[PDB]
């Protein structure tokens, strides 16, 4: 008989080539061990795009709802998005809604294989990147002042005090951009970092630009180091620990030169680029973990990586693809484990234990996808294409769950 | 005798460790060699406090009016800053001010040392950085909105349209930040780059988030495609140069991987962290130039790294240091060399070059600063402290000028 579930996952779908990837995921790795309950949304771009967002807001209620959610990478229409599937309009990013619903820390950490050494010569252990997932710019306002003018931010209280202070003013036409957080989700923020490195044990580094951004970026650094003065300072001397903040020029400086081995706390922008940066240069963006953790108590699992829109491409000119899919994959252990966790059903936290187990010994055993194959040394046996590589995994869980 | 110059440098002054610097550099390397002509400006912490950041409009000013500068490093001051100089104000950053009023764009480029090997395995030819110099949150207005309440951007026009768009309204304390920059402005940054490209025969690579900031980072990506399309695409594949457009973390991840030699044009933000992530992984935050060129025909020389306080307080401990001066001779290099070019006196220009090569060399041949010492191969000869290091270029400078 196959595995049992307690409670359903929710699960949103997404587009281009990790929609692709994500049946045979489910269909080979997951649906023959397990009687795989989840409550289903389509956030794929035409299903957003008939709902006008509508699917978007359901699916993040309903990860509210049950407390775990599965994601695949969606299309953020730009433009270029309108033109290429004929959208109502530039909707606005998925993540980015369903970030803002549940709030929280997203903590971005490589997924790491014996036979692929780091583009960093330094780095010798992981570095996780806990990137604030709310406000900043994944809300912005903005305007195209194509006449110029007094270009202001404003804010008016609940009784009606307006506080006003001028951007600039121009005599040409202007780009206008206006962003937020708040006090109280920075402090769930700094408290997910510090909590996070204490289980982990493991130094917090933060930075921000607060000697330009002096009242906003310097509010973070206020938060931070309060909240680590007044809650966690003789905790991390405990565990043999320590809080470093610096300006964030100079922290991407002094990383490119550390061991690694610490979690980089990143204000939400910084972690979206840094998250990169650091799967790259450890591997891949597919050999990365995503976890959302809400202080509400949810947890969102994703890649961390993006639809590989160009190898869909390749999709879709009949050519198989060596898309890797590891990201997606963990995704899904990482919130079935979560799951049976929550729902006292340790034979599905063993499953995930081997799913992920498996993953590692088949690539560094010499069978991967073409991003690892570039990559690793000594050279792989085989370059597994997308759905080969899946198999091979379905066929190592075969013979073992 | 020494040689003569037509036309002075305006000469802008700065603080701790760099100020210490300064004149050691001037004293040994320069004015035994040169009748140095400048326009002083002191652009000290404490100088700017006194005259209410004064000092610091009218070095801007005076640059424009000869039409080239060299600054040294300046501190920006946050609270820790008001209450260390006890300070009237948290002051505006000088980089701010005298680019806001050049305007212009940053060409950071890592100077390079055959006995120095990147941090990251794939990096084989020099990474240029163009940083766009002027406005986002480089001109921010920022609220801390204690009583919450509705956030705003406002334009008003100037015969009195208003045009307002909602950030978010919230109900607890929140921060708010405004930013903009110009239709304008983006066009010059997007033609220097191109022009740079060109010049210097490497592809240009560009990249914002503008599936997220659909108004403001699209009119950057749009401006650069346009511009490019009208004026420069002929000219790129006449070159054999490319340009390659994509989202930011997508171009970072990206970067982790390539062998370097393009142009990396980046957003201001964007530019003032990746150019210390350039000049780490390839040496040190030292081994950098930086110059700002101005669309309107103005040049300014710097160093990319700033003040390095942390050196400066082990400076005020008795202590000697091993602050590496190379990014400070670079400025006063290119400066003075861009000076001979515009004035017709080649002999300073001679100089400039001979200066330049001597400090390579000297590098090259095993004396060098702790910086270089700990990432060097094979190991350095002599680690000399800052003016130890001065001595010994002005020493084979004496024995050349
Ligand atoms: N939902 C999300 O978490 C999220 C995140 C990022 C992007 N996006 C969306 O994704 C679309 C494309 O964005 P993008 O191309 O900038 O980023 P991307 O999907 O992350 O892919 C960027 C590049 O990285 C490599 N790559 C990423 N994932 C890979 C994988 N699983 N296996 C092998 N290689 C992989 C590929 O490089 P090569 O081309 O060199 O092979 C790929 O083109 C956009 O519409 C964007 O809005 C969504
Ligand atoms: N005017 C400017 O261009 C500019 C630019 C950046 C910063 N700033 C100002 O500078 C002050 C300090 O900022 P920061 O410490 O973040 O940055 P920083 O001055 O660039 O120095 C950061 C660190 O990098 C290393 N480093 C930088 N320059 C070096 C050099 N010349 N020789 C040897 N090592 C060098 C040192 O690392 P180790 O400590 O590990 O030795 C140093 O502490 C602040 O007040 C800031 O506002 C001004
Ligand atoms: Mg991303
Ligand atoms: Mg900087």
Redesign the interface.
Known sequence: MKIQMKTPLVELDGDEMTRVLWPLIKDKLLLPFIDLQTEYYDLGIEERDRTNDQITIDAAEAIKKYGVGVKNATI????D?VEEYGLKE?WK?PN?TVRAMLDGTVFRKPIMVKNI?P????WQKPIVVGRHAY?D?????????E????????????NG?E??????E???????????????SIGHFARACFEYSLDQKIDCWFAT????????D??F??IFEEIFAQEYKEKFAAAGIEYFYT????V??????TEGGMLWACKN??G??????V???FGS?AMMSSVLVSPYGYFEYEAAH?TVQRHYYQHLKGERTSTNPVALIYAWTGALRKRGELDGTPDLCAFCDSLEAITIECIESGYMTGDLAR?CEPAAIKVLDSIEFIDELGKRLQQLK
Do not use: C, W
């Open positions: 953020t229409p730009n433009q998005r530039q990013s980015a050494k583009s960093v010569r330094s406000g710019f994944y809300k912005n306002a903005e305007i195209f002042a006449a110029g003018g007094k270009l202001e931010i404003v804010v008016t209280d609940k005090k506080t006003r202070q001028t951007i600039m121009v005599d040409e036409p202007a780009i206008v951009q206006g962003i937020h957080n708040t006090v109280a630009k607060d000697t330009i951004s002096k009242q906003y310097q509010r650094k206020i300006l964030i020029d100079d991407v400086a002094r990383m490119m030169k922008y910084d979206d680029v840094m998250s990169d940066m799967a790259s240069a963006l993006g990559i």
